[PDB]
Amino acid sequence: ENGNDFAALSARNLPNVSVVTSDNVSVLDVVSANKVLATQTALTQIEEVLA
Amino acid sequence: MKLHELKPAEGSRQVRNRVGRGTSSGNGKTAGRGQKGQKARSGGGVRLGFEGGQTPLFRRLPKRGFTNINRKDYAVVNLDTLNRFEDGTEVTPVVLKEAGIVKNEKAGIKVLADGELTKKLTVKAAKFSKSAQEAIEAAGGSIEVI
Amino acid sequence: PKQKTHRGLAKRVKRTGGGGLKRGRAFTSHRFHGKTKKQRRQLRKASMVAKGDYKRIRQQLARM
RNA sequence: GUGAAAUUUUAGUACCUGUGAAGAUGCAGGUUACCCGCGACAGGACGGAAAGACCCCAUGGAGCUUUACUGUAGUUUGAU
RNA sequence: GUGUAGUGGUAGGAGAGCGUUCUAAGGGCGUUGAAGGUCGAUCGUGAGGACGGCUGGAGCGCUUAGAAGUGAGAAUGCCG
RNA sequence: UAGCGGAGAAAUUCCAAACGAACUUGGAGAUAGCUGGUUCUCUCCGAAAUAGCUUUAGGGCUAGCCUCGGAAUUGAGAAU
RNA sequence: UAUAGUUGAAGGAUUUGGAAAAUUCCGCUAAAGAGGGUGAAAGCCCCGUAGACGAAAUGCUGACAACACCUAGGAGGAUCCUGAGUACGGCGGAACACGAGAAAUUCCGUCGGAAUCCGCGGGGACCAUCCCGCAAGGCUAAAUACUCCCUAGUGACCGAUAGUGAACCAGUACCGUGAGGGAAAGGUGAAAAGCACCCCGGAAGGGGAGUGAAAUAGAUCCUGAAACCGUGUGCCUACAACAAGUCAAAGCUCGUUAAUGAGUGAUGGCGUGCCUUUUGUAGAAUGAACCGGCGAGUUACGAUUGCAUGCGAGGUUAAGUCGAAGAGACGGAGCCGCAGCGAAAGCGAGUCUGAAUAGGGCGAAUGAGUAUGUAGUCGUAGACCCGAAACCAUGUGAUCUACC
């Protein structure tokens, strides 16, 4: 969602994971992957910027 | 659609034409240009419209006209553009526009008489073709040269 | 850069609304005591540009 | 004993009368001819060296002449 | 399936393909020998592709898409 | 003593082996209607050496002849 | 804050090897899985990275102190001040997109020469009304252009004929009196462990023995192609006129990716190379000595047509700001289409010409665009590459020769 960084500072894992906020979701950073995790607030935030 | 299975829209990307790579392509040894002649050096070809020696067309016929320094051309809207403001809205050369109808009012909005209107709007513009006032007052509207 | 138009043609050509071009005829600036009346009357009426030249100058008049 | 060069499409590289871009070692039809060298000559290989100096063209150059055109250094004349 | 029909070609127009280097994702091979080199009596209509024997000793293939310093027998070419 | 020049008992003679205008660097990848070259493959179709005008004649433009994509009526094409 | 630094997490065994980071088991760490190195390819061996700490000295940048400097209203309009050989005019030249043109505006050289607020300049010759300003005295940060140099980084950039001319002791060797011109040259193995000792040989060189996983890795030192030079041998060749082959074929020797097999070849048939330029080629027209390597239609900005995609009487952003040199939204100035005719005043589904309601030119009557990718062509640019004789501007030369 936003600067709850304590949930990103544990995303330097095996590159099986990669982290990104809800303002930078691009095309590739979704198409390149298979499953997607997202908190409940990030869903609504996405559903805002995307009008 | 996945990364390792990309397909472009069919018929949407041609290939190229690299000229001068061997006599089977059909374009080797004079690169699709032929024999000698100044169409076949590097950067040959004459300027546009030049005609050998003839007096070219643009000097064979005469000059004419001038340009008034202060012409005024308006931004005509004919009659059916109006036919979506059903009954009483104060059409105006202003925030009317503001609807995706007429941007860039050049020198004030004219109104024309093509081709059929059945409403009772109220029209305000900066000129009118004589038939347009008759159409408006025929359906019973108003007018004002404002 | 930008393709330059031709200030030699724009002073002789008017573009109609179907695509063609207009041009005022030649032989109308000088000695008339030679040409007849028909020959000088029928030359007050501009005409178009042939199919030929609109192939070769369709580029210089790219905008005007 | 030491040890180059220009040249060179690959070559198992004969003669006659024809034929051919109109004079052929190499095509045609005939005649002569075992394989490999060594010393001499210079008819031929349109022989080698110089992308014709003769001639024309390039809407090519450069140097020179003049009552060819256009200008100018210089000499002189008038006003201020 | 089956009938009918056509398939010489320079300048040139049109169409479909082979191959080299690199990038991206997916999936792979490699001291139990990769690239490169050599030999082979093999496969497709072409450009071209595999397989095995010897040498060699550290990196390269395959699929889909992308970008080009992408293909050489002639320039009295330039370097060894 | 110096190159828009110098020197010449005068020949277009000489000015670092080449002077009808020295050499070296820059404008400069100067310009050339002229010559030479231009690399992988298959399928389909496939010409012209003519008229007109040109400070034009080995150049160029339009017209004719070639190829590719669309619209429309045909009955317009052809050979008897 | 810039110039030295400090700290910094987690592994063993098995199979191949000369050597494991390889393979197979079983574990662990991560705010640290970016990178480099170690006897082959490492998250856990080493240097590091994520973090956290750190300056005696010197420099810069802030901040606030202290000091320096600067700055006041209202009312009156009798008289005074408000930039002089200046503005501007003629003449001759230059600068403005403006080549004297009907030529405003701005400079320069020469000559002539204004007014003073009831005044002066300008609004593209010039005049009148109106409107906007006050020249002939100076200073002034930021937003803009560049990179010899230092620091840290990146790249669908090069990998010893490439990339700077130069990866090596290079503007050096060498050439020219001088200005000036200017190369070729990287690779042993993991570690020199770089061959003690014997033998032939004057030496060089070599043969054993050794070091080494490998010496056909031995200092010309990884791999090691082609032209060119040699040794051995299976088949043929001394009555034969051969673009040098292919079709036919006896014999002789073989035995493969195992299939209507391989090598050679007595003898017969047929047959004038390759490239370019040309009406025409074997041409006695023209180019190649041979092998290898490099070596030619590209890119930016416009224009136009076909293909495709998103919206459609609409389409559509630009500069610029936040952002990782990205994406990724804001940003509606502007361009294109939706209406045309006329030189123009103008008219408007009409309009122009015309005395005309005549006729005729041009458009309407359904008739679609626009943004981007892509490809074909064209334009400005060196624009497919190589090729002159010449021209202009700074320099360098009279040690040869000419005159003194």
CSV table of N, CA, C and O in Angstrom, one decimal, chain B residues 5-105:
chain,number,residue,atom,x,y,z
B,5,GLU,N,5.9,-16.4,-25.3
B,5,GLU,CA,5.0,-16.8,-26.4
B,5,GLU,C,4.4,-15.7,-27.1
B,5,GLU,O,3.3,-15.8,-27.7
B,6,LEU,N,5.2,-14.6,-27.2
B,6,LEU,CA,4.7,-13.4,-27.8
B,6,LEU,C,4.3,-13.6,-29.3
B,6,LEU,O,5.1,-14.3,-30.0
B,7,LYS,N,3.2,-13.1,-29.7
B,7,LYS,CA,2.8,-13.1,-31.1
B,7,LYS,C,2.3,-11.7,-31.5
B,7,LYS,O,1.5,-11.1,-30.8
B,8,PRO,N,2.8,-11.1,-32.5
B,8,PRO,CA,2.3,-9.8,-33.0
B,8,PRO,C,1.0,-9.9,-33.7
B,8,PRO,O,0.7,-11.0,-34.2
B,9,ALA,N,0.3,-8.9,-33.8
B,9,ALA,CA,-0.9,-8.9,-34.6
B,9,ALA,C,-0.6,-9.2,-36.0
B,9,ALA,O,0.4,-8.6,-36.6
B,10,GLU,N,-1.3,-10.1,-36.6
B,10,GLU,CA,-0.9,-10.7,-37.9
B,10,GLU,C,-0.9,-9.6,-38.9
B,10,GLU,O,-1.7,-8.6,-38.9
B,11,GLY,N,0.0,-9.7,-39.9
B,11,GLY,CA,0.0,-8.6,-40.9
B,11,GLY,C,0.3,-7.3,-40.4
B,11,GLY,O,0.0,-6.3,-41.1
B,12,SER,N,1.0,-7.2,-39.3
B,12,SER,CA,1.3,-5.9,-38.7
B,12,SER,C,2.8,-5.5,-38.7
B,12,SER,O,3.1,-4.5,-38.2
B,13,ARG,N,3.7,-6.3,-39.2
B,13,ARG,CA,5.1,-6.0,-39.3
B,13,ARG,C,5.7,-6.7,-40.5
B,13,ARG,O,5.7,-7.9,-40.6
B,14,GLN,N,6.2,-5.8,-41.4
B,14,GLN,CA,6.9,-6.3,-42.6
B,14,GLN,C,8.3,-6.7,-42.3
B,14,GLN,O,8.7,-6.7,-41.1
B,15,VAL,N,9.2,-6.9,-43.3
B,15,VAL,CA,10.5,-7.4,-42.9
B,15,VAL,C,11.6,-6.3,-43.2
B,15,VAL,O,12.1,-5.7,-42.2
B,16,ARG,N,12.0,-6.1,-44.4
B,16,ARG,CA,12.8,-5.0,-44.9
B,16,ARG,C,13.2,-5.3,-46.3
B,16,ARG,O,12.8,-6.2,-46.9
B,17,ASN,N,14.0,-4.4,-46.9
B,17,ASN,CA,14.6,-4.6,-48.2
B,17,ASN,C,16.1,-4.2,-48.2
B,17,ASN,O,16.3,-3.0,-48.3
B,18,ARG,N,17.0,-5.1,-48.0
B,18,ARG,CA,18.4,-4.8,-48.0
B,18,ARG,C,18.9,-5.1,-49.4
B,18,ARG,O,18.9,-6.3,-49.9
B,19,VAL,N,19.4,-4.1,-50.1
B,19,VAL,CA,19.6,-4.2,-51.5
B,19,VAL,C,21.1,-4.3,-51.8
B,19,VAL,O,21.9,-3.6,-51.2
B,20,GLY,N,21.4,-5.2,-52.8
B,20,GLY,CA,22.8,-5.4,-53.1
B,20,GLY,C,23.5,-6.5,-52.3
B,20,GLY,O,24.5,-6.3,-51.7
B,21,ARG,N,22.8,-7.6,-52.2
B,21,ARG,CA,23.4,-8.8,-51.5
B,21,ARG,C,23.2,-10.0,-52.3
B,21,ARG,O,22.6,-11.0,-51.9
B,22,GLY,N,23.6,-10.0,-53.6
B,22,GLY,CA,23.6,-11.3,-54.3
B,22,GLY,C,22.4,-11.4,-55.3
B,22,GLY,O,21.3,-11.0,-55.0
B,23,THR,N,22.8,-11.9,-56.4
B,23,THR,CA,22.0,-11.9,-57.6
B,23,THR,C,20.8,-12.7,-57.5
B,23,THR,O,20.2,-12.9,-58.5
B,24,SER,N,20.4,-13.3,-56.4
B,24,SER,CA,19.2,-14.1,-56.3
B,24,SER,C,18.1,-13.2,-55.7
B,24,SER,O,16.9,-13.5,-56.0
B,25,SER,N,18.4,-12.3,-54.8
B,25,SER,CA,17.4,-11.4,-54.3
B,25,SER,C,16.7,-10.7,-55.4
B,25,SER,O,15.5,-10.3,-55.2
B,26,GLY,N,17.3,-10.5,-56.5
B,26,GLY,CA,16.8,-9.7,-57.6
B,26,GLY,C,17.3,-8.2,-57.6
B,26,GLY,O,17.0,-7.5,-58.5
B,27,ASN,N,18.0,-7.8,-56.6
B,27,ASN,CA,18.5,-6.5,-56.4
B,27,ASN,C,20.0,-6.4,-56.1
B,27,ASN,O,20.4,-5.8,-55.1
B,28,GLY,N,20.8,-7.1,-56.8
B,28,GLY,CA,22.2,-7.0,-56.7
B,28,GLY,C,22.9,-6.4,-57.9
B,28,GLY,O,22.2,-6.5,-59.0
B,29,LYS,N,24.1,-5.9,-57.8
B,29,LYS,CA,24.7,-5.4,-59.0
B,29,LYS,C,23.9,-4.3,-59.7
B,29,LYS,O,23.1,-4.6,-60.6
B,30,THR,N,24.0,-3.1,-59.2
B,30,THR,CA,23.2,-1.9,-59.6
B,30,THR,C,21.9,-1.9,-58.8
B,30,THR,O,20.9,-1.3,-59.4
B,31,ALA,N,21.8,-2.5,-57.7
B,31,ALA,CA,20.9,-2.1,-56.6
B,31,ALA,C,19.5,-1.6,-57.1
B,31,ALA,O,19.0,-0.6,-56.6
B,32,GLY,N,19.0,-2.3,-58.1
B,32,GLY,CA,17.7,-1.9,-58.6
B,32,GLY,C,17.7,-0.5,-59.2
B,32,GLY,O,16.8,0.3,-59.0
B,33,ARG,N,18.8,-0.2,-59.9
B,33,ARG,CA,18.9,1.1,-60.5
B,33,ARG,C,19.2,1.1,-62.0
B,33,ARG,O,18.9,2.1,-62.7
B,34,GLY,N,19.8,0.0,-62.5
B,34,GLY,CA,19.9,0.0,-64.0
B,34,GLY,C,21.3,0.3,-64.4
B,34,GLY,O,22.3,0.0,-63.7
B,35,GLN,N,21.5,0.9,-65.6
B,35,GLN,CA,22.7,1.2,-66.2
B,35,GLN,C,23.1,2.6,-65.8
B,35,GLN,O,22.6,3.2,-64.9
B,36,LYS,N,24.1,3.2,-66.5
B,36,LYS,CA,24.6,4.5,-66.2
B,36,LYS,C,23.6,5.6,-66.3
B,36,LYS,O,22.4,5.3,-66.8
B,37,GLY,N,23.9,6.8,-66.0
B,37,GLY,CA,23.0,7.9,-66.1
B,37,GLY,C,22.9,8.6,-64.7
B,37,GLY,O,22.9,7.9,-63.7
B,38,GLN,N,22.7,9.9,-64.7
B,38,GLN,CA,22.8,10.6,-63.5
B,38,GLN,C,21.7,10.3,-62.5
B,38,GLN,O,21.6,10.9,-61.5
B,39,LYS,N,20.8,9.4,-62.9
B,39,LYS,CA,19.9,8.8,-61.8
B,39,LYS,C,20.6,7.7,-61.1
B,39,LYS,O,20.0,7.1,-60.2
B,40,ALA,N,21.9,7.4,-61.4
B,40,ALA,CA,22.5,6.2,-60.8
B,40,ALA,C,23.9,6.5,-60.3
B,40,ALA,O,24.7,5.6,-60.2
B,41,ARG,N,24.2,7.7,-59.9
B,41,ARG,CA,25.4,8.0,-59.1
B,41,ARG,C,24.9,8.1,-57.7
B,41,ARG,O,23.8,7.8,-57.4
B,42,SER,N,25.8,8.5,-56.8
B,42,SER,CA,25.5,8.6,-55.4
B,42,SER,C,24.8,10.0,-55.3
B,42,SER,O,25.4,11.0,-55.6
B,43,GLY,N,23.5,10.0,-54.8
B,43,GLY,CA,22.8,11.3,-54.7
B,43,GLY,C,22.6,11.9,-56.1
B,43,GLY,O,22.8,13.1,-56.2
B,44,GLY,N,22.1,11.2,-57.0
B,44,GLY,CA,21.8,11.7,-58.3
B,44,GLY,C,20.4,12.4,-58.3
B,44,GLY,O,20.0,12.8,-57.2
B,45,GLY,N,19.8,12.4,-59.4
B,45,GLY,CA,18.4,13.0,-59.5
B,45,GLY,C,18.4,14.5,-59.4
B,45,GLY,O,19.2,15.1,-58.7
B,46,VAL,N,17.5,15.1,-60.2
B,46,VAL,CA,17.4,16.5,-60.3
B,46,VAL,C,16.4,17.0,-59.3
B,46,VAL,O,15.7,16.3,-58.7
B,47,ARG,N,16.4,18.4,-59.1
B,47,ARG,CA,15.4,18.9,-58.2
B,47,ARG,C,14.0,18.7,-58.6
B,47,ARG,O,13.7,18.2,-59.8
B,48,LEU,N,13.0,19.0,-57.7
B,48,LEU,CA,11.7,18.6,-58.0
B,48,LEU,C,11.1,19.6,-59.1
B,48,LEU,O,11.3,20.8,-59.0
B,49,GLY,N,10.3,19.0,-60.0
B,49,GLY,CA,9.6,19.8,-61.0
B,49,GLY,C,10.5,20.3,-62.1
B,49,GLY,O,9.9,20.8,-63.1
B,50,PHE,N,11.8,20.2,-62.0
B,50,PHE,CA,12.7,20.6,-63.1
B,50,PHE,C,12.3,19.8,-64.3
B,50,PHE,O,11.9,18.6,-64.2
B,51,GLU,N,12.6,20.4,-65.5
B,51,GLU,CA,12.0,19.8,-66.7
B,51,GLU,C,13.1,19.8,-67.8
B,51,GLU,O,12.8,20.3,-68.9
B,52,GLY,N,14.3,19.3,-67.5
B,52,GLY,CA,15.2,19.3,-68.6
B,52,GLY,C,15.7,20.7,-69.0
B,52,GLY,O,16.6,21.2,-68.4
B,53,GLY,N,15.1,21.2,-70.1
B,53,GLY,CA,15.3,22.6,-70.4
B,53,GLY,C,14.1,23.4,-70.6
B,53,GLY,O,14.2,24.6,-70.5
B,54,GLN,N,12.9,22.8,-70.8
B,54,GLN,CA,11.7,23.5,-71.0
B,54,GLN,C,11.5,24.6,-69.9
B,54,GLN,O,11.9,24.4,-68.8
B,55,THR,N,10.9,25.7,-70.3
B,55,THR,CA,10.5,26.6,-69.3
B,55,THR,C,9.4,25.9,-68.5
B,55,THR,O,8.3,25.6,-69.0
B,56,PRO,N,9.7,25.6,-67.2
B,56,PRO,CA,8.8,24.7,-66.4
B,56,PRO,C,7.4,25.3,-66.3
B,56,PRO,O,7.2,26.5,-66.7
B,57,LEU,N,6.5,24.5,-65.8
B,57,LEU,CA,5.1,25.0,-65.8
B,57,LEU,C,4.9,26.2,-64.9
B,57,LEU,O,4.2,27.1,-65.3
B,58,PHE,N,5.6,26.3,-63.8
B,58,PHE,CA,5.4,27.4,-62.9
B,58,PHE,C,5.8,28.8,-63.5
B,58,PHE,O,5.5,29.8,-62.9
B,59,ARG,N,6.6,28.8,-64.6
B,59,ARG,CA,6.9,30.1,-65.2
B,59,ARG,C,6.2,30.3,-66.5
B,59,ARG,O,6.4,31.3,-67.2
B,60,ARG,N,5.4,29.3,-66.9
B,60,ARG,CA,4.7,29.4,-68.2
B,60,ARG,C,3.4,30.1,-68.0
B,60,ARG,O,2.8,30.5,-69.0
B,61,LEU,N,2.9,30.3,-66.8
B,61,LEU,CA,1.6,30.8,-66.5
B,61,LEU,C,1.6,31.9,-65.5
B,61,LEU,O,2.5,31.9,-64.6
B,62,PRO,N,0.7,32.9,-65.5
B,62,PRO,CA,0.9,34.1,-64.8
B,62,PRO,C,0.5,34.2,-63.4
B,62,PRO,O,-0.3,33.4,-62.9
B,63,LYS,N,1.1,35.2,-62.7
B,63,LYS,CA,0.8,35.5,-61.3
B,63,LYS,C,-0.5,36.2,-61.1
B,63,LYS,O,-0.9,37.0,-62.0
B,64,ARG,N,-1.2,36.0,-60.0
B,64,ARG,CA,-2.5,36.7,-59.8
B,64,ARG,C,-2.9,36.7,-58.4
B,64,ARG,O,-2.6,35.7,-57.7
B,65,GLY,N,-3.5,37.8,-57.9
B,65,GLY,CA,-4.2,37.8,-56.6
B,65,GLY,C,-3.3,38.6,-55.6
B,65,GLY,O,-2.1,38.8,-55.7
B,66,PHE,N,-4.0,38.9,-54.5
B,66,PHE,CA,-3.3,39.4,-53.3
B,66,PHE,C,-4.1,38.9,-52.1
B,66,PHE,O,-5.2,38.3,-52.2
B,67,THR,N,-3.7,39.3,-50.9
B,67,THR,CA,-4.3,38.8,-49.7
B,67,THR,C,-4.6,40.0,-48.7
B,67,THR,O,-3.7,40.6,-48.2
B,68,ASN,N,-5.9,40.2,-48.5
B,68,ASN,CA,-6.3,41.2,-47.6
B,68,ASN,C,-5.7,41.0,-46.2
B,68,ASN,O,-5.7,39.9,-45.7
B,69,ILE,N,-5.2,42.1,-45.6
B,69,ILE,CA,-4.5,42.0,-44.4
B,69,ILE,C,-5.5,41.6,-43.2
B,69,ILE,O,-5.1,41.0,-42.2
B,70,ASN,N,-6.7,42.0,-43.4
B,70,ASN,CA,-7.7,41.8,-42.3
B,70,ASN,C,-8.9,41.0,-42.6
B,70,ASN,O,-10.0,41.3,-42.3
B,71,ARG,N,-8.7,39.8,-43.3
B,71,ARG,CA,-9.9,39.0,-43.5
B,71,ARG,C,-10.4,38.5,-42.2
B,71,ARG,O,-9.7,38.5,-41.2
B,72,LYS,N,-11.6,38.0,-42.2
B,72,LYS,CA,-12.2,37.5,-41.0
B,72,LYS,C,-13.1,36.3,-41.5
B,72,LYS,O,-14.0,36.4,-42.3
B,73,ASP,N,-12.7,35.1,-41.1
B,73,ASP,CA,-13.4,33.9,-41.3
B,73,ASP,C,-13.9,33.3,-40.0
B,73,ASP,O,-13.2,33.2,-39.0
B,74,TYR,N,-15.2,32.9,-40.0
B,74,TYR,CA,-15.9,32.5,-38.8
B,74,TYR,C,-15.8,30.9,-38.7
B,74,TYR,O,-15.1,30.3,-39.4
B,75,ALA,N,-16.5,30.4,-37.7
B,75,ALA,CA,-16.3,29.0,-37.3
B,75,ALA,C,-17.6,28.2,-37.5
B,75,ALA,O,-18.1,27.6,-36.6
B,76,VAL,N,-18.1,28.2,-38.7
B,76,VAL,CA,-19.5,27.8,-39.1
B,76,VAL,C,-20.0,26.5,-38.3
B,76,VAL,O,-19.2,25.5,-38.2
B,77,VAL,N,-21.2,26.6,-37.8
B,77,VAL,CA,-21.9,25.4,-37.3
B,77,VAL,C,-23.3,25.4,-38.0
B,77,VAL,O,-24.0,26.3,-37.9
B,78,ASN,N,-23.6,24.3,-38.6
B,78,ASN,CA,-24.6,24.4,-39.7
B,78,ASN,C,-26.0,24.5,-39.2
B,78,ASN,O,-26.5,25.6,-39.1
B,79,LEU,N,-26.6,23.4,-38.9
B,79,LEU,CA,-27.9,23.5,-38.2
B,79,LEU,C,-28.2,22.3,-37.3
B,79,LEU,O,-28.9,22.4,-36.3
B,80,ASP,N,-27.6,21.1,-37.6
B,80,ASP,CA,-27.9,19.9,-36.9
B,80,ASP,C,-27.0,19.7,-35.7
B,80,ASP,O,-27.3,19.0,-34.8
B,81,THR,N,-25.8,20.4,-35.7
B,81,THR,CA,-25.1,20.6,-34.4
B,81,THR,C,-26.0,21.1,-33.3
B,81,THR,O,-25.9,20.6,-32.2
B,82,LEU,N,-26.8,22.1,-33.7
B,82,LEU,CA,-27.7,22.6,-32.7
B,82,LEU,C,-28.8,21.6,-32.2
B,82,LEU,O,-29.3,21.7,-31.2
B,83,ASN,N,-29.0,20.6,-33.1
B,83,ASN,CA,-30.2,19.8,-32.8
B,83,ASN,C,-29.9,18.7,-31.7
B,83,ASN,O,-30.2,17.5,-31.9
B,84,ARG,N,-29.3,19.2,-30.6
B,84,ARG,CA,-29.2,18.3,-29.4
B,84,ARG,C,-29.2,19.1,-28.1
B,84,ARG,O,-28.6,18.7,-27.1
B,85,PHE,N,-30.0,20.2,-28.1
B,85,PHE,CA,-30.1,21.1,-26.9
B,85,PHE,C,-31.5,21.4,-26.6
B,85,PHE,O,-31.9,22.5,-26.4
B,86,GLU,N,-32.3,20.3,-26.3
B,86,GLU,CA,-33.7,20.2,-26.7
B,86,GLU,C,-34.5,21.4,-26.7
B,86,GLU,O,-35.0,21.9,-27.8
B,87,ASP,N,-34.8,22.0,-25.5
B,87,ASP,CA,-35.7,23.2,-25.6
B,87,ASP,C,-35.4,24.2,-24.5
B,87,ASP,O,-35.9,24.1,-23.4
B,88,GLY,N,-34.6,25.1,-24.9
B,88,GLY,CA,-34.2,26.3,-24.0
B,88,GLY,C,-33.0,26.0,-23.3
B,88,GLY,O,-33.0,25.3,-22.2
B,89,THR,N,-31.8,26.4,-23.8
B,89,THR,CA,-30.6,26.2,-23.2
B,89,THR,C,-29.6,27.4,-23.3
B,89,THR,O,-28.5,27.3,-22.8
B,90,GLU,N,-30.0,28.4,-24.1
B,90,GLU,CA,-29.2,29.6,-24.3
B,90,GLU,C,-27.8,29.2,-24.9
B,90,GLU,O,-26.7,29.3,-24.3
B,91,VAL,N,-27.9,28.7,-26.1
B,91,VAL,CA,-26.7,28.4,-26.9
B,91,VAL,C,-25.9,29.7,-27.0
B,91,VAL,O,-26.4,30.8,-27.2
B,92,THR,N,-24.6,29.5,-26.9
B,92,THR,CA,-23.7,30.7,-26.7
B,92,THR,C,-22.3,30.3,-27.3
B,92,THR,O,-21.9,29.2,-27.2
B,93,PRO,N,-21.6,31.3,-27.8
B,93,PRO,CA,-20.3,31.0,-28.4
B,93,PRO,C,-19.2,30.7,-27.4
B,93,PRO,O,-18.0,30.7,-27.7
B,94,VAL,N,-19.7,30.4,-26.2
B,94,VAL,CA,-19.0,30.3,-25.0
B,94,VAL,C,-19.3,28.9,-24.5
B,94,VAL,O,-19.7,28.0,-25.4
B,95,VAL,N,-19.3,28.6,-23.2
B,95,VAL,CA,-19.3,27.3,-22.6
B,95,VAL,C,-20.2,26.3,-23.2
B,95,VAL,O,-20.2,25.1,-22.9
B,96,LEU,N,-21.1,26.8,-24.1
B,96,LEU,CA,-21.6,25.8,-25.1
B,96,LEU,C,-20.4,25.0,-25.6
B,96,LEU,O,-20.5,23.8,-25.7
B,97,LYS,N,-19.3,25.7,-25.9
B,97,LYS,CA,-18.3,25.0,-26.8
B,97,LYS,C,-17.8,23.7,-26.1
B,97,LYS,O,-18.1,22.7,-26.5
B,98,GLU,N,-16.9,23.8,-25.0
B,98,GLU,CA,-17.0,23.1,-23.8
B,98,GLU,C,-18.0,21.9,-23.8
B,98,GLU,O,-18.6,21.6,-22.8
B,99,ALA,N,-18.2,21.3,-24.9
B,99,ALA,CA,-19.0,20.1,-25.1
B,99,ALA,C,-18.4,19.2,-26.2
B,99,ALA,O,-19.0,18.2,-26.5
B,100,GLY,N,-17.2,19.6,-26.7
B,100,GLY,CA,-16.7,18.9,-27.9
B,100,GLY,C,-17.5,19.2,-29.1
B,100,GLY,O,-17.9,18.3,-29.8
B,101,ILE,N,-17.8,20.5,-29.4
B,101,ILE,CA,-18.5,20.8,-30.6
B,101,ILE,C,-17.6,21.8,-31.4
B,101,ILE,O,-17.3,21.5,-32.5
B,102,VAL,N,-17.3,22.9,-30.8
B,102,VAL,CA,-16.5,23.9,-31.5
B,102,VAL,C,-15.5,24.5,-30.6
B,102,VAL,O,-15.8,25.3,-29.7
B,103,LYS,N,-14.2,24.1,-30.8
B,103,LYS,CA,-13.1,24.8,-30.2
B,103,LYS,C,-12.5,25.8,-31.2
B,103,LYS,O,-12.8,25.7,-32.4
B,104,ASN,N,-11.7,26.7,-30.7
B,104,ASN,CA,-11.1,27.7,-31.5
B,104,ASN,C,-12.1,28.5,-32.4
B,104,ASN,O,-12.1,28.4,-33.6
B,105,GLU,N,-12.9,29.3,-31.7
B,105,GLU,CA,-13.7,30.3,-32.3
B,105,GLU,C,-12.8,31.2,-33.0
B,105,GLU,O,-12.2,32.1,-32.4
